[PDB]
Structure 1
C-alpha cells in the first residue's frame, strides 16, 4: 500500500485530465479545461468534451449522469478529504468512483496521478516514467555535480503588484531541491509555505541568484503578471539578468512524472551552458 512497488467510459474530474490524456483515452466528461495547463492541441482537443465540473471544482452530478460513465476518477487535496467522502457516495450512484488524496505541493501530486494512471489501466508507462525520473535525477546530479555545487537558482512567478519566489517544498522549487541544486535566500521567509512574496522594491532579494527561472504556461508563455515582473527596471539590475541567465520554465506544477521530467530536461539544458 505504498506508491513504489517491489473501464471504457471515463469521467475525469480534477487531475483526471492529465491522466487520461497521457493514456490516450478519450473522456466522456471532463472538468472545465484551463488553457494554461495544456498545449494548444490538447486544449482544442479537450474542448470537444462535455464539461461536468466547473473550474471552481463545483460538480454537476446531472451532467455526469448523462455522460454515463463506468468509472469516475480524480485527485483530492487531502485537506478536503471528509468533504469528498460524501461526494464519492453521491458519485458512486452513477458509477464506481476512484479518488486519491495528495498532500503538499511536491512529490505528492505526481505520485497521486501515478495511482490514477494505474487505475485507468496505464500503469506501465506511468511506472516507467517514475523510474526514469529517479534515474535522470541520479544521472544529472553527478554529470553536472560541479555546476550544481556553485550555482544558486531561483524560481519566480508574478502576481498583482507583487511577485513570488518558489520554496524548496513546492513545484519547480521542489524538483530543483530534489536534484540537489542550491536556491536563493529569497526562499527563507516562506518557511513551510509554498512561496515567499515580495514587492517590486524587494527585487534585490534575488541578487544571490546566478540563474533565474520564471513560470510559463504549457506553451512557454508567461502570464501578464510574470511579464510585468520582467519589465520592472529594478529587475534589469540583478546579476543573473545581465548575465543572460533568465529562462522560462514549463510545467513547474508537474502534475505527473512525465511533466516532472520535462522540468528535469529544462533544468538540464541550462546546466549545459553553465
Structure 2
C-alpha cells in the first residue's frame, strides 16, 4: 500500500499471464497455458503465443532470447528466492527482469500480481481493483452480518481418491474468513496447511455445512475429481446437498484483485438467497 517505461515486448513467466491478460497486452513468450486458469477464449488466444517455460517451471533461456523482449515478468515462491536471484542474473543478460515474491496461498498472490501489473504500466486498473475489493468486503461483511454468522460454509475440491476442504488461510477460504463467515469443523484439522484432506468414507465430515462451494475452472465446470466427489453416495445425504445449497465457485485461487472480486460477487449471490 502507498501513502523500462512503456514496454513493448513482454515475456510472462509463471503468474505473469494473468497480469498481461488483465492489461490488454499481448505477450511475446509465455508459460505453458493450463486451460483451467482461463476463459476458453483466453486459452485459445494464449495457445498461439510462444511457449517459453514448461508447466513444471523449467525455463527455456533460448526461447526467451529468440522472443527478444524489453521485459521479463514473473512471480516467485518466497522459499525459492535464493534459486531465482541466480535465474534473474542469468536472464538479465537478455532483458530487464522483474520477479516478485509472495508467501502462502492468501493475499500474497493478489498483492504480488498487483506489483507486476504496476511494472507493466497497468498500475491504475490494478490499484482500482484493490480498492474495490477492500470496499466490498466492508460492504458485504456488514450488510449480511446476520447471514454470515448464522451460516456454516464449506469450500471443497476433489483430488484423486480424496477431497479437500480449503482452510482459512488460502484461496476462497481466506476470502470467506476475512468476510467473517464461519466454516465447517472439517476445516480445523488443516492447521497451517491450505486444506484438510479426507476419504470418500469421511464425506459426513461436511454434515454441519449449510452451504457448500465447490471449486471450478474459469468456465464454471468442475474438474473430473471434483465431479467424482459430487457423484459419491454419501454426498447425497448432506444437509447442505439435499437442501439444494451446493454452488460452484469460479476463480477460487484469486491470483489477482479482479479475480478476488469475482469470488466476492459469487459469495454475495449466495448470501442474498439466504
Per the normalisation by structure 1, the TM-score is 0.98
Distance 1:5 1:235, change over 3 A: farther
Per-residue CA deviation, residues 51-85 of structure 1 (Å, 9 max, x unaligned), is: 00000001000000000001000100001110001
CA distance in 1, matches of 2:266, 2:74: 28
RMSD: 2.5
Q: CA deviation at 1:48?
A: 1.2
Q: Is the contact made by 2:4 and 2:71 (CA closer than 8 Å) also made in structure 1?
A: no
Q: Quick one: distance in 2 between partners of 1:3 and 1:35?
A: 38
Does the 8 Å contact 1:3/1:111 carry over to 2?
no
- Contact 2:6 2:120 survives alignment (8 Å): no
The Cα of 1:234 is off from its aligned counterpart by: 0.5
Inter-CA distance 251–5: structure 2 relative to 1 (3 Å threshold): farther
- Equivalence for 2:179: 179
Q: Is contact 1:155-1:213 (8 Å) kept?
A: yes
Say if 1:146 and 1:5 are closer, same or farther in 2 by CA, change over 3 A.
Answer: farther
Asked if 1:45 is matched to 2:45, the reply is yes
Once the two structures are superposed, what CA deviation does each residue of 1:18-51 show, in whole Å capped at 9, x if it has no partner? 0000000000000000000000010001011100
How much does 1:181 deviate? 0.6
Structure 2 CA distance for aligned equivalents of residues 6 and 135 of structure 1: 30
Give 1:8 shift. Answer: 1.0
Q: CA deviation at 1:123?
A: 0.4
Tell me the TM-score normalised to structure 2 length: 0.98
134-143 or 6-15, larger mean C-alpha shift = 6-15
Question: How many residue pairs end up in the alignment?
Answer: 274
1:207-230 C-alpha deviation (Å, 9 max, x unpaired): 110000000000001011100000
Unmatched 5+ residue regions in structure 1?
Answer: none
Question: Gapped runs of 5+ residues in structure 2?
Answer: none
Query: Structure 1 runs of 4+ off > 2 angstroms?
Result: 1-6
CA contact (8 A) 1:129 1:258 kept: yes
Shift of 1:262: 0.2
